[PDB]
Amino acid sequence: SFLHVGAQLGTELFIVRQLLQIVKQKTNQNSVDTTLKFTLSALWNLTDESPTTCRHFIENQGLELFMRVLESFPTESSIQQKVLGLLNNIAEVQELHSELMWKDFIDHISSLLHSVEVEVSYFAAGIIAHLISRGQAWTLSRSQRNSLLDDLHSAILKWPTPECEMVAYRSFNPFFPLLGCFTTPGVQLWAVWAMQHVCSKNPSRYCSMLIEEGGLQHLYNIKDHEHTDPHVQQIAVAILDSLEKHI
Amino acid sequence: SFLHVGAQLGTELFIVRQLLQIVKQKTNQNSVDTTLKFTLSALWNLTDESPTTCRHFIENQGLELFMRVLESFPTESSIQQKVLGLLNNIAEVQELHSELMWKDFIDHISSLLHSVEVEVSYFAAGIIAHLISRGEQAWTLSRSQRNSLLDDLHSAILKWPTPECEMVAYRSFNPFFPLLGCFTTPGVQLWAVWAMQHVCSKNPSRYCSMLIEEGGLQHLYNIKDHEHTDPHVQQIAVAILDSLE
C-alpha cells in the first residue's frame, strides 16, 4: 500500500531535497565520509534520464552547493567524479542549458578537464561536450568556447585506457546528437571515445544496446563524410570493426 | 549516466537508511515537523510491493524505531497512520513474518486496533489479519492472544464508519487474495473484503477494473458459493460482486 495515487513523485523530490541537505552539512564539516560519497552517488543515480529531478536539483540551488563541494575537496577524486557525473546528467537536458551558463561553473569544469585522473576529466569533458553541443545559446565568452573545444580535443587524446568501467549507461541516445556535430571535432571525439570505452569494458551489455538503438548508423555516417577529423574517424572505425564481429 | 550497473539498489537502500535516521532524529526531539511525516510517507511508499526494502527496514532496526515513534506520539493521527501503513506493507511479506512476532509489537498493534479513527485502526487490522492468516503453528507467541485477536479484528471492522477522503492506495490486490481463502479465520476474510469494497467504492474507475483483471472476481465468488462461510464476510463479498457486475 501507499498513501494515495501519485504520491511517489512528491517523496522523490523530497528525497532529493534531503540528500542536498546532507551534502551541505557534510561540506560544512569538511567530512569526506562514506555517507557523503553514498549521497553523491544517490544524487547522480537519481538524475539518470530524469529531467524533472535535474530541474528540482537546480531549483533547490543544488549546483551552487556542488560548486562549493568541488572547492572544499579539491584533491578528492571520488567526490569530484560523482559531482561531475550528476552535472553531466544535467548537461544532457536541453531545457536547463540556460542555468549552467555561469562562468564560475564553466571555470571549474575547465579546470577539472585537466585532471590527471581520467575518471574525473572524462565527466568534465562530457559536460563540456554537451554544452558546446547547442551551437549559439552560449550566453558567455566565446573566447572560452573556442578555448574549451580545443582543450576538449587535446585532453581526450591524452587519456589512457581506464582500469575499471568509470560509468554506466542505460541508453546511448544522448550521444547521438553529439555525433552529428562535424563542425566541432572535440564533441564527437568525446562521444566516440566514451562509446568505445564502455563497449570495450562491457561488450556483453553495451554492444547489443549500441546496435539496437541504431548507433552503428551515426558511426557509419562519420566513417566517410570526408570532412571528418582523423582522430574521431579512427575511433569510429575501431568501434565499427569491433561491433561488426559481435553480430 | 550513473555510478555502475546495479547501483540503483544500493542507492535506494541508502535512502531507506537515511530516512530512518531522520525519523530517529525527529523522535529524539519531540518534533512533529513537516519533514518527519514526509519522511514517513517516503518510507511507506518505498516499502510498497518491495520485499527488499522492507527487509532492509527490518535489518536497520526499523521496527523498534517505529514503535518508539508510536509510543512517543500517541495522539498524532497522520504519524500513526503512516507508521502502521508501512508496517502493513511489511506484514504482507511472508519471509519477514517471524520478525513481527515481537510481544510489545503485537500488544501495541492490538491497542491501535481498537482506535476509532479509522485511518489508524485500518492499518493495524491489516497487520493483524496478515499475521494470523499464516496459520497457528506460525504464531510463535501467546495463542490466547492469537485466538482473541481473530475475534477482536472481526468486531473492530464491524464498528467502522466508511472513510471520507483518500485513506490508502494500492498498485495491485494480489496481497489480499490469500486472505480471501482463510475460511478458518473469518476476521482475515472480512478485513480483506472490507478493504476491497472501500477502495472499489471510492475509486471505482481504477480499483474495480484492477480487481477484475487480477482475477479477484473468482475469489470473492468462491466465497459466495462456498457454503459454511461467515455471514458478515458473505454479505460484504456478494455486495462487492453485485456492482462488480
Residue numbers in the entry:
A (entry chain A): 479 to 613, 615 to 726
B (entry chain B): 479 to 723
Q: What does the publication say?
A:
ZER1 and ZYG11B, the substrate receptors of the Cullin 2-RING E3 ubiquitin ligase (CRL2), recognize N-terminal (Nt) glycine degrons and participate in the Nt-myristoylation quality control through the Gly/N-degron pathway. Here we show that ZER1 and ZYG11B can also recognize small Nt-residues other than glycine. Furthermore, we present the crystal structures of ZER1 and ZYG11B bound to various small Nt-residues and uncover the molecular mechanism of non-acetylated substrate recognition by ZER1 and ZYG11B. In conclusion, we propose that ZER1/ZYG11B not only targets Gly/N-degrons for proteasomal degradation, but it also has the ability to bind a defined selection of non-Ac/N-degrons by a conserved molecular mechanism of substrate recognition and target their degradation through the non-Ac/N-degron pathway.
To understand the molecular basis of ZER1/ZYG11B-mediated binding of non-Gly Nt-residue peptides, we determined the crystal structures of ZER1 bound to either SFLH-, AFLH- or TFLH-peptide, as well as the crystal structures of ZYG11B bound to either SFLH-, AFLH- or CFLH- peptide. Meanwhile, ZYG11B displayed appreciable binding to Nt-Ser (KD of 6.8), -Ala (KD of 7.1), or -Cys (KD of 3.0), albeit slightly weaker than Nt-Gly (KD of 2.5). Structural comparisons indicated that the peptide-binding modes of ZER1 and ZYG11B are similar. The free α-amino group of the Nt-residue forms hydrogen bonds with the side chains of Asp556 and Asn597 in ZER1 (the counterparts of Asp 526 and Asn 567 in ZYG11B), respectively. Furthermore, the carbonyl oxygen of the Nt-residue is stabilized by two hydrogen bonds from Asn597 and Trp552 in ZER1 (Asp 567 and Trp522 in ZYG11B). The main-chain amide of the third residue on the peptide is anchored by a hydrogen bond with Asn553 in ZER1 (Asn523 in ZYG11B). It is worth noting that the side-chain hydroxyl group of Nt-Ser makes additional hydrogen bond with the side chain of Trp552 in ZER1 (Trp522 in ZYG11B), suggesting a critical role of the Trp552 in binding of Nt-Ser. Besides, a strong π-π interaction was formed between the aromatic side chain of F2 and the indole ring of Trp 552 in ZER1 (Trp 522 in ZYG11B), this observation is consistent with our SPOT-array results that ZER1 and ZYG11B prefer an aromatic residue at position 2. Likewise, consistent with the structural observations, the mutants W522A, D526A, N567A, E570A and N523A in ZYG11B were defective in binding to the XFLHVGQD (X = Ser, Ala or Cys) peptides. These results suggest that ZER1 and ZYG11B utilize a conserved binding pocket composing a set of hydrogen bonds to capture either the Nt-Gly or small non-Gly Nt-residues.
